[PDB]
């Protein structure tokens with residue numbers, strides 16, 4: 001409706017008997033392949049991303065936002081737990097880091 | 107072919123030019139309408155040869171290789187169910203090319219979700235895409251993943267009911 | 277010739293692979309929409325008869 005791509009903002013310009021809209025949009029570029037999974041199996045529990053998606057660069061699993069590649073460590077702060085690992089088709093095994101663990105470790 | 111009639115008709119001026127111009131404008135407007143509706147992608151996307159979409163069946167909407175027209179069963183049913191100086195101009199886009207445009211749109215929305223509409227087509231598994239759509243309407247991803255077989259069965263049943271309803275309603 | 281609808285593109289679909297963008301382009305596009313016409317008035321009596 002407001003240009004090709006993900007619309008950010010627009011500018012109106014007057015024209016003789018008309019209007020010209022300059023649509024400023026965000027276009028994704030330089031995409032890269034990653035190996036993905038619906039959920040992460042850890043401690044007999046299924047972990048799902050709160051807002052992102054699980055990706056793998058070949059050896060390590062990360063969670064990233066869907067529209068830009070920004071890999072982050074899969075923790076309990078960016079994932080939520082629902083059910084065990086027996087129901088979700090395609091769940092993979094990976095560790096889930098806990099930020100609270102070094103606090104009581106020290 | 108009457109010369110006297112044309113000589114008398116010339117007394118009325120450029121009425122004929124106005125009518126021809128209006129009809130020409132309508133005729134080009136129809137082609138513009140078809141371009142606006144169907145030609146929204148500049149890439150002709152194709153489905154993978156293996157139709158492994160996590161239980162989701164799209165055979166009733168994807169083009170049939172057995173048919174020479176390369177139409178879907180639903181599109182084939184739709185085409186079957188629709189039946190002195192005058193000329194009929196052919197449309198600029200033929201039916202097979204319009205079907206090809208719809209096939210490209212279907213392949214893009216199945217293999218890439220909404221990414222192809224906003225830029226380059228980014229591949230994503232179809233259950234994950236469905237989970238994204240579930241999150242769009244405010245339902246968590248887990249609900250989709252846990253009940254994936256049920257959701258796929260419901261979708262296939264609904265698509266079959268659509269074909270039956272179109273074939274059974276005049 | 278018979279027209280080509282678009283450049284051919286086969287998306288590499290598989291059940292466990294995703295494509296994630298690593299960059300972006302800020303794209304500005306133009307959309308021209310007519311708003312008004314020339315306001316014309318015709319004196320019917322003067323036009324037909326003067």
Ligand SMILES: *[C@@H]1O[C@H](CO)[C@@H](O[C@@H]2O[C@H](CO)[C@@H](O)[C@H](O)[C@H]2NC(C)=O)[C@H](O)[C@H]1NC(C)=O
Nearest residue numbers: 034055056057058059060061062071072073074
């Ligand atoms: C996937 O990304 C991870 C994280 O960047 C890579 O792990 C790093 O690899 C470098 C290269 O040897 C090491 O120096 C770092 O210490 C590693 N980081 C961690 C946290 O282990 C991993 O190698 C990448 N995999 C591929 C196939 O590129």
Ligand SMILES: *[C@@H]1O[C@H](CO)[C@@H](O[C@@H]2O[C@H](CO)[C@@H](O)[C@H](O)[C@H]2NC(C)=O)[C@H](O)[C@H]1NC(C)=O
Nearest residue numbers: 040041042043044045084085086091092093094
């Ligand atoms: C992921 O981890 C789970 C749990 O450790 C694995 O499930 C085990 O699989 C072995 C061999 O198939 C069985 O003997 C165990 O009883 C299973 N445990 C449970 C709790 O189900 C699973 O196979 C692992 N998957 C991968 C790909 O490594």
Ligand SMILES: *[C@@H]1O[C@H](CO)[C@@H](O[C@@H]2O[C@H](CO)[C@@H](O)[C@H](O)[C@H]2NC(C)=O)[C@H](O)[C@H]1NC(C)=O
Nearest residue numbers: 156157158159161162163164165166179262266
């Ligand atoms: C997807 O749905 C189609 C249509 O319902 C299935 O095709 C049917 O397959 C059965 C068994 O092979 C046949 O007896 C039917 O006659 C087929 N129907 C039609 C319309 O051809 C198809 O098997 C389903 N699954 C896949 C993976 O394509």
Ligand SMILES: *[C@@H]1O[C@H](CO)[C@@H](O[C@@H]2O[C@H](CO)[C@@H](O)[C@H](O)[C@H]2NC(C)=O)[C@H](O)[C@H]1NC(C)=O
Nearest residue numbers: 030031032033034229286287288289293295296
């Ligand atoms: C992601 O991987 C797929 C498959 O390896 C790549 O698709 C191939 O691209 C090459 C180059 O255009 C083609 O010759 C192959 O035929 C493609 N294979 C398939 C199955 O489509 C794809 O290009 C990769 N994407 C990125 C960004 O590297």
Ligand SMILES: *[C@@H]1O[C@H](CO)[C@@H](O[C@@H]2O[C@H](CO)[C@@H](O)[C@H](O)[C@H]2NC(C)=O)[C@H](O)[C@H]1NC(C)=O
Nearest residue numbers: 028029030031032069297298299300301302303
């Ligand atoms: C993302 O794309 C931008 C282009 O918009 C890249 O910026 C270019 O980087 C090259 C190499 O450093 C420069 O020669 C160009 O002049 C840059 N262009 C502009 C407009 O600044 C940017 O480096 C890319 N980033 C990544 C991570 O790929």
Ligand SMILES: *[C@@H]1O[C@H](CO)[C@@H](O)[C@H](O)[C@H]1NC(C)=O
Nearest residue numbers: 037038089090091158291292
């Ligand atoms: C993808 O399909 C392969 C078979 O080709 C299967 O082994 C694998 O488990 C599937 N992965 C997912 C996530 O469905």
